[PDB]
Amino acid sequence: VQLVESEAEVKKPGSSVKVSCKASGGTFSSYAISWVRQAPGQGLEWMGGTIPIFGTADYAQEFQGRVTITTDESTSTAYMELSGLRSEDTAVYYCVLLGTTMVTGHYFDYWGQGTLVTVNFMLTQPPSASGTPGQSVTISCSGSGSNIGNNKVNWYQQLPGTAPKLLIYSNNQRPSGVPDRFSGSKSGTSASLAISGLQSEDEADYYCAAWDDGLSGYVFGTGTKLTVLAA
Numbered sequence: 001v002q003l004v005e006s007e008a009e010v011k012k013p014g015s016s017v018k019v020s021c022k023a024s025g026g027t028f029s030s031y032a033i034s035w036v037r038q039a040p041g042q043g044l045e046w047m048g049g050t051i052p053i054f055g056t057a058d059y060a061q062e063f064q065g066r067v068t069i070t071t072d073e074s075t076s077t078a079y080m081e082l083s084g085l086r087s088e089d090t091a092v093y094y095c096v097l098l099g100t101t102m103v104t105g106h107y108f109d110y111w112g113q114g115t116l117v118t119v120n121f122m123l124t125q126p127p128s129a130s131g132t133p134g135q136s137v138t139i140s141c142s143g144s145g146s147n148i149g150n151n152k153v154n155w156y157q158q159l160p161g162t163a164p165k166l167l168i169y170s171n172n173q174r175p176s177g178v179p180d181r182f183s184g185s186k187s188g189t190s191a192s193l194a195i196s197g198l199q200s201e202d203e204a205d206y207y208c209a210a211w212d213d214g215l216s217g218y219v220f221g222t223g224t225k226l227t228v229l230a231a
């Protein structure tokens with residue numbers, strides 16, 4: 001399963017940009033495509049997405065007016081257009097496949113590597129965390145009843161200069177490939193990611209996330225920079 005987004009684009013203020021992404025080697029029609037952006041040095045912001053079967057698009061309220069998401073089933077290609085470009089809109093624009101696995105049918109999540117385009121509610125996380133290799137650290141995520149209280153929590157790892165990767169879904173489930181030293185949990189309006197037997201490769205940004213019934217949008221945490229201190 002393979003994502004290819006459009007090449008990096010410099011753009012004039014006031015204009016509009018269409019980012020594309022093409023997906024290969026799966027059932028395109030069975031995926032939800034979502035779009036998430038990240039300004040340099042900053043966090044994640046859901047713009048919107050399509051849902052399968054119905055083919056209907058939906059949008060984060062800060063972007064209503066300005067965004068048109070569209071999907072071409074023929075070419076297995078999603079498109080995101082945002083207009084009225086300001087400097088604030090400078091960001092890496094990620095397309096994200098959401099789906100269920102073929103055999104067991106559990107959730108999964110695949111992020112494109114992002115299109116840099118050159119020209120805000122969030123869950124609470126501590127800004128930083130650290131440990132020496134072998135140690136255990138726990139990263140916390142705090143929200144409210146309308147999000148973490150009522151909805152499934154995901155955790156995303158983000159290595160420097162790379163796209164987020166799903167670590168935990170459905171509060172405590174690990175995708176295939178994720179080591180059992182990562183553990184998820186939630187209780188009330190609060191969630192936790194536990195990392196045991198810490199390794200240098202874990203130096204990364206960790207984001208919790210969940211849907212919010214009040215806002216009617218997908219909400220990321222402020223993120224936690226985990227520094228693995230030698231040694």
Ligand SMILES: NCCOCCOCCNC(=O)CCC(=O)NCCC[n+]1ccc(Cc2sc3ccccc3[n+]2CCCS(=O)(=O)O)c2ccccc21
Pocket residue numbers: 034035036046049051058096098107109152153154170210211218
């Ligand atoms: N007077 C009116 C007052 O009352 C309102 C009544 O009127 C009706 C109110 N209307 C509704 O019920 C709308 C509900 C609905 O299904 N929307 C369509 C879809 C909207 N959506 C879109 C997207 C997501 C999840 C997303 S977006 C995304 C982007 C990147 C990475 C992950 C990611 N993820 C994670 C998904 C995994 S999990 O599910 O969280 O584990 C949703 C998650 C849950 C529910 C809806 C979701």
